[PDB]
Design a protein around this ligand. Structure first.
Ligand SMILES: CC(=O)N[C@H]1[C@H](O[C@H]2[C@@H](O)[C@@H](NC(C)=O)[C@H](O[C@H]3[C@H](O)[C@H]4N=C(N(C)C)O[C@H]4[C@@H]3CO)O[C@@H]2CO)O[C@H](CO)[C@@H](O)[C@H]1O
Length: 273
């Protein structure tokens, strides 16, 4: 399979263009559109990469195009660990979908935050807030595909199944790729010498939801997460040989570009994925 990487949350991790040029990644998720819903003006946060005011982040379209030209799919990730995002009603789900269509997808807007490039899809990293309406938001985004160009839908649920926030949305069967976060969650992550919890969880995910492909999401360095880091050798010798048996296996997902560079994680596992 391939590696999905998240980019955006550390100004020192390189440009989107550089990130794609590594040839290590097949999917790039831009993190994050962390404020939206409830009448708020949506706002993108890309840490020190750029300031979205006055079109300061439109420069990112150069990288988006550069990635796409190389066959890499680029998604805008909603949510994250920090943010006041939520959906207040089904109407809010519709307003948000329309805003996303016009500002990041095939629609039209005078103030597209990342410029004129058209992103491949939308990634859902909903970690707190409202548990309602994410399925409607997925439906409304998916309907825009009917205009001709596919809007990919991807999701980053946490490993305990089912996910309190994304369970219903994942049940719609609309998601193309689901990179489950097998960390920061004791009952379903790796712990020294024990791979049972992670495998058992992987089995639940791959047999329970209908999505195109499911990915094993991991922290790329011990600093990238509170818990659940898996040393490369253990992944390669014990985990991959098992999870690759599933026909739904798509690859591995890592948080994040910054930590991957520091720890050389994808460099170590690339050919085994
Ligand atoms: C306020 C804001 O939007 N951003 C902050 C930025 O917050 C980052 C960091 O706290 C990240 N922490 C680490 C260790 O990288 C944090 O990463 C979370 C992420 O939200 C979750 N989603 C995933 N996926 C795999 C999808 O994984 C987890 C990881 C933890 O593993 O994300 C927050 C933003 O949500 O912090 C910077 C630097 O301090 C600050 O400038 C500002 O940019």
């Amino acid at each position: 399979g391939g590696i999905a990487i998240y980019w955006g949350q550390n100004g020192n991790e390189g440009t989107l263009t550089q990130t794609c040029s590594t040839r290590k990644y097949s999917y790039v998720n831009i993190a994050f559109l962390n404020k939206f819903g409830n009448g708020q003006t949506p706002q993108i946060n890309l840490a020190g990469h750029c300031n979205p005011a006055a079109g300061g982040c439109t420069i990112v379209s150069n990288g988006i195009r550069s990635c796409q030209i190389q066959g890499i799919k680029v998604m805008l990730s909603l949510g994250g660990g920090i943010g006041s995002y939520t959906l207040a009603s089904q109407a809010d789900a519709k307003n948000v979908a329309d805003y996303l269509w016009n500002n990041f997808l095939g629609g039209k807007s005078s103030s597209r935050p990342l410029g004129d490039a058209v992103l491949d899809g939308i990634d859902f990293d909903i970690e707190h807030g409202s548990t309602l309406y994410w399925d409607d938001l997925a439906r409304y985004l998916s309907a825009y595909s009917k205009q001709g160009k596919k809007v990919y839908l991807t999701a980053a649920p946490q490993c305990p199944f089912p996910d309190r926030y994304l369970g219903t949305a994942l049940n719609t069967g609309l998601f193309d790729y689901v990179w489950v976060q097998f960390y920061n969650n004791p009952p379903c992550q790796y712990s020294s010498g024990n791979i049972n919890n992670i495998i058992n969880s992987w089995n639940r995910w791959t047999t329970s939801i209908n999505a195109g492909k499911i990915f094993l999401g991991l922290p790329a360095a011990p600093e990238a997460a509170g818990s659940g880091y898996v040393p490369p050798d253990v992944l390669i010798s014990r985990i991959l040989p098992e999870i690759k048996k599933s026909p739904k296996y798509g690859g591995v997902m890592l948080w994040s570009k910054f930590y991957d560079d520091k720890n050389g994680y994808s460099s170590s596992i690339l050919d085994s994925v």
